[PDB]
């Protein structure tokens, strides 16, 4: 089997990208962010403390005849933002772009931290990361994309983000028409649970490449690109009036600049993030300072490429037996 499913943009700066998701019988649509840096399937609900639901569309379990509680489980997560959520454990049928689950764990939340609610959009997220980071307790569940492994064509899922445009998550092939030149593949490590890899470099601009070993993690759950401060010093000092701001919370750039683009290693092979990929805009309506797109991740505690970098990929997850990575140009 197989499936293929658009990714939208929520907003014109490409904050996060929403999926459509059915869930139970009759299906109940809901938009999910498809998240590789997390391994749960959350979704806001009827059970959802009332004022913590905000214009999402939610899940009610006893409209479906397939969903069934799963007896004693419950679920809290917080994600590297701060945010979070919790609740319980329902399973049911799940369907996205046309592969369905039976028995998936719908994480039905009762509670759900205010950037949630004040996210009009996003109905809930939708693991991709490894099944070990799943939070369900006291048994551990399985992503979606574990359930389907064994039934897919090809025990893969891709990501074809767009820039300010609708993308694709396709599960079970590789779409050969999605790319330019040749897939590169790339070493996984999944003892933090994480798609981790290791970048061979970078270079800004039209500057030398740089051979270097960045180790991190993709993620098309972060909006942006964090990587090391001597790396991110590097980029933004080719950017006049480029500072890195404490008050703001990261580099500010005057919105009156060109920026650079910014240009990753996959073993020998480059990925060019065009410059205007790096712009998100002012940091208050009306200002003309505006926040960058490649941040350090000094006291995150690990690199996160993350949409900034990822929309400039066609990007395969391979769950082969052994994980790899794959990325090319499109």
């Known amino acids: ?79 590297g933002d701060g945010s979070s959520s919790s609740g319980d454990v329902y399973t049911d049928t799940v369907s996205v772009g046309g592969l369905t689950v039976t028995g998936q764990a719908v994480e039905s939340a009762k509670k759900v931290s205010s950037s949630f609610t004040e996210d009009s959009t996003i109905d809930g997220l939708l693991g991709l990361a490894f099944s070990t980071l799943n939070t369900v307790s006291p048994t551990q569940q399985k992503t979606f994309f574990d359930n389907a492994k064994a039934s897919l064509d090809s025990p893969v899922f891709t990501a074809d983000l ?41 270079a800004v601009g039209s500057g030398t490449f740089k051979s270097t070993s960045i180790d991190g993690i993709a993620d098309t759950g972060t909006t942006l690109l964090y990587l090391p401060a001597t790396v991110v010093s590097a980029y933004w000092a080719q950017v006049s009036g480029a500072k890195s701001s404490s008050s703001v919370g990261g580099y500010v750039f005057p919105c009156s600049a060109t920026l650079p683009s910014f240009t990753f290693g996959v073993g020998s092979a480059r990925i060019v993030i065009p410059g205007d990929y790096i712009d998100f805009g002012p940091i208050s309506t009306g200002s003309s300072s505006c926040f960058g797109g490649i941040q350090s991740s000094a006291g995150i505690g690990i690199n996160i490429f993350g949409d900034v970098a990822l929309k400039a990929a066609f990007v395969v997850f391979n769950g082969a037996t052994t994980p790899t990575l794959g990325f090319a140009s499109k």
């Open 1 to 79: 089997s197989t499936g293929s499913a658009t990714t939208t943009p929520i907003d014109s700066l490409d904050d996060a990208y929403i999926t459509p998701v059915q869930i139970g019988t009759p299906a109940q649509t809901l938009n999910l962010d498809f998240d590789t840096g997390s391994s749960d399937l959350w979704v806001f609900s009827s059970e959802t403390t009332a004022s913590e639901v905000d214009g999402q569309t939610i899940y009610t379990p006893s409209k479906s005849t397939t969903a069934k509680l799963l007896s004693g489980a419950t679920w809290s997560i917080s994600y």
């Open 162 to 202: 767009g820039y300010h445009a609708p993308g694709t998550y396709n599960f079970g092939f590789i779409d050969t028409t999605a790319y330019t030149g040749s897939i590169t593949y790339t070493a996984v490590s999944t003892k933090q649970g994480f798609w981790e890899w290791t970048s061979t470099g970078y």
